[PDB]
Amino acid sequence: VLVQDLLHPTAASEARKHKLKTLVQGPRSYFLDVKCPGCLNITTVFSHAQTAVTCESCSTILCTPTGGKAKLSEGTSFRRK
Amino acid sequence: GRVRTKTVKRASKALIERYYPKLTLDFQTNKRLCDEIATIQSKRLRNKIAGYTTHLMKRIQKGPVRGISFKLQEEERERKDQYVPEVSRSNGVLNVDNQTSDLVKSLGLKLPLSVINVSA
Amino acid sequence: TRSSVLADALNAINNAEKTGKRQVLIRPSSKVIIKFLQVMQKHGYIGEFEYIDDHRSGKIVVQLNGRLNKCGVISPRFNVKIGDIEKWTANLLPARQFGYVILTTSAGIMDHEEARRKHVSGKILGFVY
Amino acid sequence: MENDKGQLVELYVPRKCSATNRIIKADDHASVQINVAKVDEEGRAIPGEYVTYALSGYVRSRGESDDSLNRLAQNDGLLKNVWSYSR
Amino acid sequence: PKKRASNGRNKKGRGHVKPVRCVNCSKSIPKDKAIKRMAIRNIVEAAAVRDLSEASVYPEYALPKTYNKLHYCVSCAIHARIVRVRSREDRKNRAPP
Amino acid sequence: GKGKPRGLNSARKLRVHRRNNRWAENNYKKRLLGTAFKSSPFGGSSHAKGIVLEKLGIESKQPNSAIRKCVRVQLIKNGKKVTAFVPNDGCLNFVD
Amino acid sequence: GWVPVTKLGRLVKAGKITTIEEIFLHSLPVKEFQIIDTLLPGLQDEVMNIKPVQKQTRAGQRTRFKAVVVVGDSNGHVGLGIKTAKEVAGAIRAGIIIAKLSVIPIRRGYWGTNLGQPHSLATKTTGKCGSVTVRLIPAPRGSGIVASPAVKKLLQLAGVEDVYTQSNGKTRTLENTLKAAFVAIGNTYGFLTPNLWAEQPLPVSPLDIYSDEASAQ
Amino acid sequence: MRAKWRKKRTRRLKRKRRKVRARSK
Amino acid sequence: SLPATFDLTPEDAQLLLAANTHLGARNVQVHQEPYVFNARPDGVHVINVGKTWEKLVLAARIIAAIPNPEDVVAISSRTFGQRAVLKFAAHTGATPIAGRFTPGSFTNYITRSFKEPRLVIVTDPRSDAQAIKEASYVNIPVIALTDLDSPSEFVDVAIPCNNRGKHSIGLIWYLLAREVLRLRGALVDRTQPWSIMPDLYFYRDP
RNA sequence: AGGGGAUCGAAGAUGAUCAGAUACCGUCGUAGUCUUAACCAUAAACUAUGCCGACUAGGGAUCGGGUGGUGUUUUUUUAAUGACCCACUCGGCACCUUACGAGAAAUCAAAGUCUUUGGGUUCUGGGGGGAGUAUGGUCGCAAGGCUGAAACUUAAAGGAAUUG
Ligand SMILES: [Mg+2]
Ligand SMILES: [Mg+2]
Ligand SMILES: [Mg+2]
Ligand SMILES: [Mg+2]
Ligand SMILES: [Mg+2]
Ligand SMILES: [Mg+2]
Ligand SMILES: [Mg+2]
Ligand SMILES: [Mg+2]
Ligand SMILES: [Mg+2]
Ligand SMILES: [Mg+2]
Ligand SMILES: [Mg+2]
Ligand SMILES: [Mg+2]
Ligand SMILES: [Mg+2]
Ligand SMILES: [Mg+2]
Ligand SMILES: [Mg+2]
Ligand SMILES: [Mg+2]
Ligand SMILES: [Mg+2]
Ligand SMILES: [Mg+2]
Ligand SMILES: [Zn+2]
Ligand SMILES: [Zn+2]
């Protein structure tokens, strides 16, 4: 308070703020590859589905939509990039 | 009722304020004292006074009384001061929360470690 | 909706100072805002600032110091006819000896004293003391 | 404040806070001046010799007296850590 | 002028509550202003509980009190009950007992 | 920035509003209405010569008690009738 | 004889401070008036206005009397002092004291150009009080004082030669006006004009350098 | 007189001035 | 201007932790507090007692810095402080104020409680507020013990501590005494556990 | 204009009260109260406080959404759920303490960032009474709505706080 750096703010209390109210605004959502081990290849699903993403070959499911992030259907793996 | 007035209670205070190395718990002498050290124009009032400063004297003897602070109390206190022999070195070692010990590491040095947890 | 970009960042600078602060974060930044914020710095009234590149209009972090009393914007950017440039300073400046009416001219953004020495006039922006 | 031919005219060139550099004027009796004592080798605190500051009434009214002290004395190198310009 | 920022009594963001009739004088009044008491009390009373369990069947029985919500109209609430009148400041106090 | 339009083009709005709110001014309203010439027994003028009808004796207003001696006048230029005072001790003797 | 209580009441008689400007440099709170008497003998009283005020009493009506006074020299030191007291005289006895304590400094200056010995003000300065705001517009030389009878008098004593004034409120209520005018000229060592931007080495409190030459007994 | 009732006072008075003017049409 | 071995020491560290001087206030938390050091769950914020030390050193370095050690002033109406201050006040020139204060002590010479000091120290700026207020009516600096809820208006230099009872207070005061003696004072060199017991500076019983 | 018409109930009639008592209290009860079709367009229609944008200060609650956890509680076999709990974050209805600040004050996180007076925009007021009256216009079945003066009169009306 009264004296501090708006230019180099802690990566932590920066981290806890709104997605618009950061220093430089940017998102907080991510992407991931997903597998239902019947398969061999993987699909890339956005963290916030809106649409219930459907697998590549087998019309199986993959995830469900919510009020934000998606619920990955049951027997699934992932990794974030 | 026999509530002493202010002029009574006032005087007696200042009386004890500077003639405790004198007086007593006895009225009759405290009475004869007043004439010597303080000037008043009334027999009635003088006794009226002494009696109470005599009472005041009687209850100081068993612990201080407010208003009167003839400084002999502040310096009887000063030497009266002391206690301890046991401190807080025993037994075991300085028990701490995780973070408190995480604190030490993240600043300090050698500390007798003894860490438990906590719950909701 | 947001109406004079200058005006906001200007006021904030004031409310920072007033609140005893030493830095301000201003948004959305602009050519005008800079070239104004340039002139304050030039005469001692704030320190150094920094443009940050949001991929939008901009954010500016100002380092101010304490010398500054008031920085204000004139909100219908009136026209000043070189005779009238005296009338303005007179109206709103604390003394003859210091402080500036800053304004906008075809010959550039500048303080009336420089817009005196250059002998060009135009529209009026704001001021500093 | 000078004058035609030299001559420092106008009495009193008042103090100034250290965290705000506002003037500290006569009637502000809520202002302050904290002398830190210069020490030397082995504890001894060299008397009549200080690194000093002045906190304006306003600042310590708002309660910024403590933080601002920290920051000020630390960059004067007499507090190691305690403070962080980043937050 | 004004002498309550709650105003008369409790209504922020409603604009119309809807009234209740005064238990004591049938006066309408908005339920938010209602000044209410919860008359939970024994069916019997003081001395009758003995005479109750005395000339009765059952082991001590059970005894089930009689609850009703009361609504007062101020000039009713004031004329008797929870009201008194409070200092400029004691007024502010929302605490019950 | 309460009220008024600050725009550099709001000239008309502003000058118009003034025209309107000069009407709240009693001295102005009176002047354009020509209250002067229309009502008021004197034309627009400083004095007016008339003629005496009757000598009157007005009891003052409170908390003053008196009999204030004035005259009912038929204004020559004009017709209209006026009651007017006769100042100083006596004087009401001087009329008829 | 004096006999001063307060540390500062002592260092003063003890010829250990020469000018109030020290007190001002160190914002020291004056409590014993004879401090400013020795520190500034060129002061003269000025009773500005006297008005009656009344209170009803469970047994009595009480018409004590406000008196309002302005003490000062004509070299930058003024007091506005106000007290109601049950005798007129006494009110003017106490007020002057209060007005003495109250004494502040005045930053005065030049209209335009440098020349010699400030005739006017540093800046414009507004003092508001109750409903009256005074404004002090720095005037050119020989302008004199452009202010109502009272406020003019408050400035001459303040030792101010050229300054304009606007005012704004219920000015007829003098008490509130002078109290504002006072603030307006107690506001002139507030203004951080650029000449004052320099860093002076931050002086050391008299109470410490003559700490021995102070203290009780 | 009460504010209410004076508005009804004058209200009435108009309704009759009306009546009377209508006699003249 | 950094001494050398005026670092926090393990003998000191042990001291503070038995007193629980690093157990700063609960939910309660004045914004003005960076003296924190990570939240323990069960809502108890832990105090970075190195800073606690460093401040102490500073407070010392200012207490011993006023020409007459007797217009340096102790305060505590809080019973967990009265035996502390008094004892601090005996060991150093400073005049104590333990018990009720009494308002008009810095303004109004006309009183007999009257003091006129150049530095006021205090335990709990809540209960002692009168001091902290009245001191500001008359440019007096303030040294103060503080928890995480302590109101730091009109008090410079906080000593992030623990007014939650026990030994913390008593500790700190004894430590202040320690280092004002160790500063320009008849004491001694290195480690030097100091002849005086810290358990001295304590609130009594029953 | 139909329907409906329990209740309660302008008007009216009553019983008492009162000196009077067209009332207050009690009775009887018309219209009304509810609904459909169309009118009326008014309330202290109130926060007696325009809208959009910005900036300035602390605290715990709470409503909806979201995010975070080797959090509790739900047992089955761990989950999955759901309801809790803690932190953080938007945006809501509020209350708390502060007073940098504002006010004539009461009080105000806006009623603040105003003689250091300019972000944008709408609306109204300019002593009291005469008067929301007269007049014309217009809307309406009506009752009435909107628009809306002057002559004259007058030295005060008024606000907030203090003491009685
Ligand atoms: Mg009322
Ligand atoms: Mg409504
Ligand atoms: Mg009108
Ligand atoms: Mg006639
Ligand atoms: Mg003709
Ligand atoms: Mg007069
Ligand atoms: Mg006919
Ligand atoms: Mg019916
Ligand atoms: Mg009837
Ligand atoms: Mg009858
Ligand atoms: Mg009838
Ligand atoms: Mg209306
Ligand atoms: Mg309402
Ligand atoms: Mg808030
Ligand atoms: Mg969750
Ligand atoms: Mg009348
Ligand atoms: Mg009269
Ligand atoms: Mg009133
Ligand atoms: Zn699949
Ligand atoms: Zn009722």
Three-state secondary structure of chain H: CCHHHHHHHHHHHHHHHHHHHHCCC
B96, I46 Cβ separation under 8 angstroms: no
Task: Please report, as a single letter, which amino acid is at residue E5.
Answer: A
Q: Note down the domain range covering A25.
A: 1-81
Task: Take residue G33 and report the two structure tokens written for it.
Answer: 């008036």
For residue I100, give the 3-state DSSP assignment. Answer: coil
Question: Does C65 reach chain D within 8 Å, measured CB to CB?
Answer: yes
Q: How many domains does chain A contain in total?
A: 1
- Interchain contact, A9 vs D68, CB within 8 Å: no
Q: What is the CA radius of gyration of chain C?
A: 14
| Residue of B22, B20, B13, B15 whose CA lies nearest to B39 | B15
Our CA angle for I36, I38, I40, nearest 5°, is: 115
State the distance between the two ends of chain E, measured CA to CA, in whole angstroms.
29
Are C94 and C64 in a shared domain? no
- Interchain contact, A2 vs D85, CB within 8 Å: no
For residue I61, give the 3-state DSSP assignment. Answer: helix
Alpha-carbon span F33 to G122, nearest angstrom: 51
| Residue of G164, G141, G142, G139 whose CA lies nearest to G152 | G164
Task: Take residue I94 and report the two structure tokens written for it.
Answer: 């400073």
Residue D64 C-beta-side C-alpha neighbours within 13 Å: 23
**Neighbour order of strands in the sheet with G163-168:** G125-129, G132-138, G163-168, G145-146
D33, D52 Cβ separation under 8 angstroms: yes
Task: Take residue I12 and report the two structure tokens written for it.
Answer: 């000191």
Largest CA distance in chain E: 63
Which residues from C are below 8 Å from A5, CB to CB?
23
Alpha-carbon span A74 to E3, nearest angstrom: 62
Question: Which DSSP category does D85 fall into?
Answer: S
I25, I147 Cβ separation under 8 angstroms: yes
Alpha-carbon span E87 to A10, nearest angstrom: 50
Question: Which DSSP category does A80 fall into?
Answer: B
Q: Which residues contact F54 (CB under 8 A, 6 or more apart)?
A: F71, F72
Q: Which residues contact I122 (CB under 8 A, 6 or more apart)?
A: I75, I76, I128, I131, I132, I142, I143, I144, I145, I155
Resolution (Å units): 3.3
- Which ligand approaches the C-alpha of residue F29 most closely? 3
Question: Which DSSP category does I96 fall into?
Answer: P
Question: Does G27 reach chain D within 8 Å, measured CB to CB?
Answer: yes
Strand partners, G64: G53
For residue B54, give the CATH number of its domain: 1.10.60.20
| Residue of D39, C94, D24, A28 whose CA lies nearest to G123 | C94
Residue I19 C-beta-side C-alpha neighbours within 13 Å: 30
Residue E67 C-beta-side C-alpha neighbours within 13 Å: 2
Q: Give the closest nucleotide to E13 (alpha carbon vs C1').
A: J93
Count of CB atoms situated within 10 Å of the CB of I155 = 27
Task: Take residue I44 and report the two structure tokens written for it.
Answer: 């108890």
Alpha-carbon span C41 to E81, nearest angstrom: 69
Q: Note down the domain range covering F89.
A: 1-96
For residue I158, give the 3-state DSSP assignment. Answer: strand
Q: Note down the domain range covering B29.
A: 6-61
Q: What are the CA-CA distances from residue B71 to residues B64, B81, G170, H10 (Å)? A: 11, 15, 58, 86
Task: Take residue D34 and report the two structure tokens written for it.
Answer: 């904290």
Q: What is the 3-state secondary structure (H, E, C) of chain F?
A: CCCCCCCCCCHHHHHHHHHHHCCCCHHHHHHHHCHHHHCCCCCCCCCCCCCEEEEECCCCCCCCCCCCCEEEEECCCCCCEEEEECCCCCCCCCCC
| Residue of C3, C48, C2 whose CA lies nearest to C22 | C48
Alpha-carbon span G195 to G199, nearest angstrom: 11
Our CA angle for G152, G153, G155, nearest 5°, is: 70
Question: Which DSSP category does C113 fall into?
Answer: T
Q: B76's torsion region: left (phi>0), alpha (psi -120 to 50) or beta?
A: alpha
Helices (H) and strands (E) in chain D, counts: 2, 2
Alpha-carbon span F42 to C93, nearest angstrom: 52
Do you find a cis peptide bond into C28, omega within 30 degrees of 0? yes
Whether the CA torsion C1, F3, C15, G193 is positive or negative: it is positive
Task: Take residue C4 and report the two structure tokens written for it.
Answer: 């004079």
For residue D41, give the 3-state DSSP assignment. Answer: coil
Task: Please report, as a single letter, which amino acid is at residue I20.
Answer: N
Closest CA in chain C for residue A2: C21
Element (H, E) at I149: none
Closest CA in chain I for residue G207: I118
For residue A17, give the 3-state DSSP assignment. Answer: coil
Q: What is the CA radius of gyration of chain G?
A: 19
Task: Take residue G18 and report the two structure tokens written for it.
Answer: 């020469």
Task: Take residue A26 and report the two structure tokens written for it.
Answer: 């940017």
Alpha-carbon span I15 to B88, nearest angstrom: 8
Alpha-carbon span G36 to F22, nearest angstrom: 56
Alpha helices in D10-83 (DSSP H): 57-62, 65-75
Question: Does I22 reach chain B within 8 Å, measured CB to CB?
Answer: yes
Question: Which DSSP category does E67 fall into?
Answer: -
Count of CB atoms situated within 10 Å of the CB of D12 = 19
Closest CA in chain C for residue G111: C96
| Residue of C18, B71, C119 whose CA lies nearest to A2 | C18
Do you find a cis peptide bond into I206, omega within 30 degrees of 0? yes
Q: How many domains does chain F contain in total?
A: 1
> How many Å apart are F8 CA and J124 C1'?
23
Our CA angle for C29, C33, C35, nearest 5°, is: 130
State the distance between the two ends of chain I, measured CA to CA, in whole angstroms.
46
Burial I109-146 (b: 16+ CB within 10 A, else e): eeeeebebbbbbbbbbbebbbbbbebbbeebbbbbbbb
Which residues from D are below 8 Å from A4, CB to CB?
85-87
Instruction: Name where chain F breaks: residue before each gap, C-N > 2.5 Å.
Output: none
Count of CB atoms situated within 10 Å of the CB of C20 = 22
User: Of the residues C16, C42, C68, which one is the last residue of a structural domain?
Assistant: C68
CA of residue H10 to ligand 7 center, whole Å? 25
Experimental method: X-ray
Q: Note down the domain range covering E41.
A: 1-97
Count of CB atoms situated within 10 Å of the CB of G182 = 23
Task: Take residue E65 and report the two structure tokens written for it.
Answer: 């009190």
C71, C13 Cβ separation under 8 angstroms: yes
**Neighbour order of strands in the sheet with I142-146:** I120-122, I142-146, I158-160
Q: Which residues contact E92 (CB under 8 A, 6 or more apart)?
A: none
Which residues from C are below 8 Å from G122, CB to CB?
95
C36, C8 Cβ separation under 8 angstroms: no
Task: Take residue B17 and report the two structure tokens written for it.
Answer: 């304020």
Length of chain F: 96
Pairing between strand I120-122 and I142-146? parallel
G32, G9 Cβ separation under 8 angstroms: yes
Question: Which DSSP category does I195 fall into?
Answer: S
Count of CB atoms situated within 10 Å of the CB of B109 = 11
Element (H, E) at G72: strand G60-72
Residue written as token pair 């499911």? A61
Q: Which residues contact B84 (CB under 8 A, 6 or more apart)?
A: I197, I199, I200
Task: Take residue C115 and report the two structure tokens written for it.
Answer: 């817009």
Report CA D84 to chain centroid distance, whole Å. Answer: 20
Alpha-carbon span C24 to C33, nearest angstrom: 14
Q: At what angle do helices B27-37 and B43-60 cross, to 10 degrees?
A: 120
Q: Which of G27, G29, G211 sits opposite I67 (nearest CB)?
A: G211
Alpha-carbon span D53 to G51, nearest angstrom: 47
Q: Give the closest nucleotide to C13 (alpha carbon vs C1').
A: J55
Alpha-carbon span A75 to A36, nearest angstrom: 6
Task: Take residue F42 and report the two structure tokens written for it.
Answer: 């004197």
CATH class of D1-87: alpha beta
| Residue of G96, G170, G163 whose CA lies nearest to G136 | G163
Task: Take residue C75 and report the two structure tokens written for it.
Answer: 């909100």
I97, D77 Cβ separation under 8 angstroms: no
Report CA B22 to chain centroid distance, whole Å. Answer: 21
For residue G52, give the 3-state DSSP assignment. Answer: strand
Alpha helices in chain G (DSSP H): 7-13, 20-25, 34-39, 88-101, 149-157, 174-185, 206-209
Question: Does C66 reach chain D within 8 Å, measured CB to CB?
Answer: yes
Alpha-carbon span I36 to I49, nearest angstrom: 9
Best of B71, B107, B115, B118 to substitute, by most chain I Cβ atoms within 10 angstroms, is B107
Cβ contacts below 8 Å, chain C against chain D, sum to: 15
| Residue of G59, G10, G75 whose CA lies nearest to G207 | G10
For residue D36, give the 3-state DSSP assignment. Answer: strand
Task: Take residue F3 and report the two structure tokens written for it.
Answer: 């009220």
Phi, psi of A34 (to 5 degrees): -130, 140
Task: Take residue I62 and report the two structure tokens written for it.
Answer: 């200012």
Task: Take residue G70 and report the two structure tokens written for it.
Answer: 């302005």
Q: Which residues contact F87 (CB under 8 A, 6 or more apart)?
A: none
Residue E74 C-beta-side C-alpha neighbours within 13 Å: 8
For residue A44, give the 3-state DSSP assignment. Answer: strand
